[PDB]
């Protein structure tokens, strides 16, 4: 097997000349030369089998990415794993090489309005497709927005995705208030909130709603949006949450133009509509694409949707890790030599 920085990366003979890129979640990521397609690709090593939660996320990501086909969503090109379930300990997922991500970019670069608009278009175009499949991504953040050298953007990491019907993360700053308040009845609107947080961060190079825990983040949200109105408070279906919010001192709205006065006024108008406290008043993906800020891109004939809504055969939340291993073995089989 080929070796990378201490660890087995057993992807030859098809994939060679490995180069460590970094860490994903359950393994390292390398770039490799694909000797069949004659191009460099990305390969992520996943080792999920000893943990039920890692297996659920791996199965979710594989099933969704194999079903989706869209320019602004990362694909799965190939999957390498052992020929028998007993020998399978690691799974290697092969994808288009994307040289950076919005998280890395924002670390060093102040983006022009032109690039902010172009990125925001691509994010919404991919998200239109995800939502049309009846899927919620639930974990949109800059590090999940991959970029190549010519500003093409692809959404990745569907480990936490769910089919819509009204979990540890390192990064909490893109989560909707209704999620942090434990409200009953989440929708696609949680993804629009995340995109709004991303747009704000493209405008300023720092998270707009940081905080050490959900209560600190809620304080940052209310410090900008202002205290919720009575009707928006009532949208929170959690009495303990409503009481907590009522316990806080009153805060006036800080207009977005005061925070980001360099920003395009149309960008701020759309930001305002994505970052509404009440999810029922939050702009939807199709309406966002149709917003004046995006007018130079907006093209419904060139913004495709899924052929039919996505459907999980089984609820995964309940399944033992051994059953999940069987499903991952089945799901990955199409890439095997001699598959039929």
Residue 169 sits in a domain whose CATH number is 1.10.510.10
Residue labelled with tokens 């995340």: 194
Q: Both 257 and 240 in a single domain? A: yes
Q: Both 80 and 115 in a single domain? A: no
Q: Which of 116, 121, 113, 112 is nearest to 295 (CA)?
A: 121
How many structural domains is the chain composed of?
A: 2
Q: Is 152 a catalytic residue?
A: no
C-alpha–C-alpha distance, residues 193 and 174, integer Å: 7
Q: Both 104 and 137 in a single domain? A: yes
Q: List the binding residues for ATP.
A: 21-29, 44
Q: Which of 194, 198, 11 is nearest to 92 (CA)?
A: 11
Beta bridge partners of 8: 3
Instruction: Give Cα 264 to chain centroid, integer Å.
Output: 25
Q: What one-character DSSP code corresponds to residue 73? A: B
Q: What one-character DSSP code corresponds to residue 277? A: S
Q: Both 330 and 220 in a single domain? A: no
Q: Both 68 and 183 in a single domain? A: no
For 338, residues 6+ apart whose C-beta sits below 8 A from its C-beta are: none
Neighbours of 232 (CB within 10 A): 18
C-alpha–C-alpha distance, residues 30 and 185, integer Å: 39
Q: Both 222 and 325 in a single domain? A: no
Q: What's the length of the chain?
A: 340
Whether the CB-CB separation of 94 and 15 falls below 8 Å is answered with yes
Whether the CB-CB separation of 122 and 287 falls below 8 Å is answered with no
**CATH code where residue 58 lies:** 3.30.200.20
Whether the CB-CB separation of 298 and 290 falls below 8 Å is answered with yes
Q: Which of 195, 203, 137 is nearest to 164 (CA)?
A: 137
320 by Cβ neighbours in 10 Å (0-12 / 13-18 / 19+) ranks as exposed
Tokens of 271: 């930001």
Tokens of 195: 């995109």
C-alpha–C-alpha distance, residues 256 and 269, integer Å: 8
Instruction: Give Cα 123 to chain centroid, integer Å.
Output: 10
Resolution in Å equals: 1.8
Q: Both 80 and 135 in a single domain? A: no
- Could you list the residue range(s) of the whole structural domain that residue 37 is in? 1-97+320-337
C-alpha–C-alpha distance, residues 256 and 226, integer Å: 12
Residue labelled with tokens 């994307």: 98
Instruction: Give Cα 258 to chain centroid, integer Å.
Output: 29
Q: Both 69 and 140 in a single domain? A: no
Out of 34, 90, 139, 191, the active site residue is 139
C-alpha–C-alpha distance, residues 134 and 33, integer Å: 35
Q: Both 142 and 258 in a single domain? A: yes
SS3 328: helix
C-alpha–C-alpha distance, residues 88 and 69, integer Å: 27
C-alpha–C-alpha distance, residues 332 and 80, integer Å: 8
Please state how this structure was obtained. X-ray
Neighbours of 2 (CB within 10 A): 15
Whether the CB-CB separation of 271 and 200 falls below 8 Å is answered with yes
SS3 122: helix
Whether the CB-CB separation of 45 and 60 falls below 8 Å is answered with no
For 192, residues 6+ apart whose C-beta sits below 8 A from its C-beta are: 127, 274, 282, 283, 284, 285, 288
Q: Both 130 and 272 in a single domain? A: yes
Q: Which of 33, 27, 31 is nearest to 42 (CA)?
A: 31
CA dihedral (168, 140, 229, 249) in degrees, to 10, reads 50
The last residues before gaps in the chain (C-N over 2.5 Å) are 166
Q: Both 246 and 140 in a single domain? A: yes
Q: List the binding residues.
A: 21-29, 44
Tokens of 75: 């694909």
C-alpha–C-alpha distance, residues 30 and 46, integer Å: 12
Query: How many angstroms separate the most distant Cα atoms in the chain?
Result: 66
Q: Both 52 and 69 in a single domain? A: yes
């Amino acid at each position: 097997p080929e070796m990378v920085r201490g660890q087995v990366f057993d992807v030859g003979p098809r994939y060679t000349n490995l180069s460590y890129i970094g860490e994903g979640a359950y393994g390292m990521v390398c770039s490799a030369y694909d000797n069949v397609n004659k191009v460099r690709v990305a390969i992520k090593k996943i080792s999920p089998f000893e943990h039920q939660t890692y297996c659920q996320r791996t199965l979710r990501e594989i099933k969704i990415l194999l079903r989706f086909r869209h320019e602004n969503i990362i694909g799965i090109n190939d999957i390498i794993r052992a020929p028998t379930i007993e020998q399978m300990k690691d799974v290697y997922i092969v994808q288009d090489l994307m040289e950076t991500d919005l998280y890395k970019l924002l670390k060093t670069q102040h983006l022009s309005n032109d690039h902010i608009c172009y990125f925001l278009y691509q994010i919404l175009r991919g998200l239109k497709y995800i939502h049309s499949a009846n899927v919620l991504h639930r974990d949109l953040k800059p590090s999940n927005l991959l970029l190549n050298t010519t500003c093409d953007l692809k959404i990745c990491d569907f480990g936490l995705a769910r089919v819509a019907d009204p979990e540890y993360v390192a990064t909490r700053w893109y989560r909707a208030p209704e999620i942090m308040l434990n409200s009953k009845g989440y929708t696609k609107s949680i993804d629009i909130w995340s995109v709004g947080c991303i747009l704000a961060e493209m405008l300023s190079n720092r998270p707009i709603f940081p905080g050490k825990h959900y209560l600190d983040q809620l304080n940052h949200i209310l410090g900008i949006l202002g205290s919720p109105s009575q009707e928006d408070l009532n949208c929170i279906i959690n009495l303990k949450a409503r009481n907590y919010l009522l316990s806080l001192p009153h805060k006036n709205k800080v207009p977005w133009n005061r925070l980001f006065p360099n920003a395009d006024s149309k960008a701020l108008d759309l930001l305002d509509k994505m970052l509404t406290f009440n999810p029922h008043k939050r702009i939807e993906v199709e309406q966002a694409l149709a917003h004046p800020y995006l007018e130079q891109y907006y093209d419904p004939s060139d913004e495709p949707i899924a052929e039919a809504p996505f459907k999980f055969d089984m609820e995964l939340d309940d399944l033992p890790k051994e059953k999940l291993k069987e499903l991952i073995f089945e799901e990955t089989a199409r890439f095997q030599p001699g598959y039929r």
